[PDB]
Ligand binder design. Sequence first.
Ligand SMILES: O=C(O)CCCC[C@@H]1SC[C@@H]2NC(=O)N[C@@H]21
Ligand SMILES: O=C(O)CCCC[C@@H]1SC[C@@H]2NC(=O)N[C@@H]21
Ligand SMILES: O=C(O)CCCC[C@@H]1SC[C@@H]2NC(=O)N[C@@H]21
Ligand SMILES: O=C(O)CCCC[C@@H]1SC[C@@H]2NC(=O)N[C@@H]21
Lengths: 120, 119, 120, 120
Amino acid sequence: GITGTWYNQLGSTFIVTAGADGALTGTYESAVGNAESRYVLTGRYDSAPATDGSGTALGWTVAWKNNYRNAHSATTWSGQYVGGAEARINTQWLLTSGTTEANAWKSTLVGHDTLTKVKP
Amino acid sequence: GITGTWYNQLGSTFIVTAGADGALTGTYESAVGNAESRYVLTGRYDSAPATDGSGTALGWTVAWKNNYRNAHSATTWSGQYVGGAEARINTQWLLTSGTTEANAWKSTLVGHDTLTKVK
Amino acid sequence: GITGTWYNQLGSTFIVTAGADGALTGTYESAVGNAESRYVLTGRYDSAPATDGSGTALGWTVAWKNNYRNAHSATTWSGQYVGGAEARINTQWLLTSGTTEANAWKSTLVGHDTLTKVKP
Amino acid sequence: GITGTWYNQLGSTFIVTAGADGALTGTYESAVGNAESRYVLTGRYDSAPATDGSGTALGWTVAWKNNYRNAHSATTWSGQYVGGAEARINTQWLLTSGTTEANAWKSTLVGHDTLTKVKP
Ligand SMILES: O=C(O)CCCC[C@@H]1SC[C@@H]2NC(=O)N[C@@H]21
Ligand SMILES: O=C(O)CCCC[C@@H]1SC[C@@H]2NC(=O)N[C@@H]21
Ligand SMILES: O=C(O)CCCC[C@@H]1SC[C@@H]2NC(=O)N[C@@H]21
Ligand SMILES: O=C(O)CCCC[C@@H]1SC[C@@H]2NC(=O)N[C@@H]21
């Protein structure tokens, strides 16, 4: 159910393939921030989730460098896939920028993204 | 500078290879939690960082399933590599457990790990 | 715009008075977790928000001890108040439980609550 | 115990009084960021912690407005007091800036501060 094209609340696009042994591969395009076009992502998911109603744990990373720009930053999303009539991925994320040691206290933004397969 | 074995403040071991393109691949072994032996990790790093002494941004994911057990959870670490005599990878992490929707509010732990070349 | 009763997505109830001195005072009642009845909250808010269309930054703390139980934990919420017809307080939170040092790595849950004037 | 003057790893100063009612009151002065001089804080702590070696849960809030400056932001620290020979407070924090709706995704920084009573 994870394999597909997903969109978050900002209008960003998450194109992912879930491999049979836990791999996530694909591309991410952010609607916001110091970013343009598509970026490589990789991650992991639980390929044998519980069967008791629980979601499927997963996470992935984007380093914000591509052929067009380099933000010197990386985001990781940690969350779960929730199956149902409308499948959803609920995440929290951490966006770390490369900083000097003096500025490291303000290196990391935190937020939450929810994704569905509905195109905006 | 990223490639190799790193140790965190909990006694865990991060073994990673940084590819020329920005790929991170390797294994993670946690000293704590619902974990035994090594787990696959994958992630990404900035392969063309600033040259002013700023850190190199990176992140990786472990899904806590291996040949030996499955915790039904995943951790992501987001942080930066700082090189030099006292090299370090400083991270914050999010550990999400599969939950029912009613329990989703308590799905996610947050913390911070510092990794060094010597334990 | 802040003083009064607010409800989050879990069904919890936030009762607050925003004082001229920047103070937040009131009670919190959680629909979930190791909690029953009302708990004291205190916090702070920006009493002179930006002259533009920006939210009002605020935060508050509950220690989860009242006359009935003690969960040996505390939650802080950090966020912003957005006024208008569909007024909202959008927050992220950190729930820290008292733990031994060996277990400190798993002391802190993170999440996000959205509060509205009408119960969802 | 908690009452006293604490310094964090950045050199910031946390002057706090822990009341018998579970209240924290005092002032905070940051070594970094969009801040000058002292700011009011308020928070809560577990006034009847466990006796099994666990820490004491606590949290507090600063809104970054005083007589001199307004950053239109608020930080909450959530953590625990660890009562060794050398007492320490270990926290994680959320710093939310007031933003427009379109920029709300980048409203919140996350980090971790550790404090002791040792004057740097
Ligand atoms: O500005 C940067 O440093 C790079 C782009 C960051 C975009 C972030 S990642 C978290 C959030 N979710 C999105 O889809 N976009 C923003
Ligand atoms: O308990 C689980 O669900 C799986 C093991 C989690 C171990 C966590 S990941 C973040 C922190 N850093 C570590 O080295 N181990 C813990
Ligand atoms: O279980 C505990 O330790 C005390 C109750 C915690 C309830 C949390 S606070 C964050 C979230 N928002 C709520 O309204 N309830 C939960
Ligand atoms: O820049 C601002 O918006 C106001 C000042 C914020 C200072 C932060 S709060 C968390 C961290 N710990 C500190 O002692 N200072 C910084």
